From a paper:
CLC-2 is a voltage-gated chloride channel that contributes to electrical excitability and ion homeostasis in many different tissues. Among the nine mammalian CLC homologs, CLC-2 is uniquely activated by hyperpolarization, rather than depolarization, of the plasma membrane. The TM region of CLC-2 displays a typical CLC family symmetric homodimeric structure, with each subunit containing an independent Cl− pathway. All eukaryotic CLCs contain a pair of ‘cystathionine β-synthase’ (CBS) domains in their intracellular C-terminal domain (CTD).
Author numbering:
A (entry chain A), B (entry chain B): 567 to 644, 783 to 841
The structure:
Amino acid sequence: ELGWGRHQQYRVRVEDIMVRDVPHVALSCTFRDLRLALHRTKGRMLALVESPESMILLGSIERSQVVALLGAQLSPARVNFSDCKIDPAPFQLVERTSLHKTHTIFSLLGVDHAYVTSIGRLIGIVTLKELRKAIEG
Amino acid sequence: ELGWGRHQQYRVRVEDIMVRDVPHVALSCTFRDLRLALHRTKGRMLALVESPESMILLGSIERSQVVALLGAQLSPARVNFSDCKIDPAPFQLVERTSLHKTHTIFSLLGVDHAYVTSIGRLIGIVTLKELRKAIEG
């Protein structure tokens, strides 16, 4: 784990290594946006946004409740996550941030992943894999 | 101090100790209401919002930036908060949180103030005065 070693990584900041692609989902009717997200992406989590070009984020959504929403459209009958749940407004990270803060947002304190952010903006999602990758290089 | 022994910090939550009138400001062009935020409440850092009908916590501004913006707008001559220094809501709170969780995010980061958000729409504000009261009452 981080810190002690030859000194060079004391320099590095979150923008220098964070992955730029976007598991976002729009606050709109289209199950096609959901289908495309579920096709293109995998793992625990997605982000919910006001619109693709405004890029304000509300919170996080996970594969089971969205494939169950698709399941609700699939049900024998003839998008609104607020009918069930939408999860906590998480931490965020600002582009300049040094690793020695970011380590103490996921540890000594329990959180799994973080959205990198700017004023009203979503830049991407960080995970422990990028983090421990960045610690080691 | 943290409290070792007989406590009800596990009984009671951020929703109980909440305070709700706040120095918030719209993204709007007019300065006629910015005049209120100068004295209608007392405090250092304000709550910038995406709309008086949405109240997403876009970020925070110190009085010395906004008073200088008014000093320029009423300079001897015959909106633009956008190019002052701004910071997004650095951490945010949700009603079901017990006092102990809050104490750790305050103390571990040296953050002086925080906002309650639920998902998006603000509910109220917190400072070192509220907790240093409520941990004894």
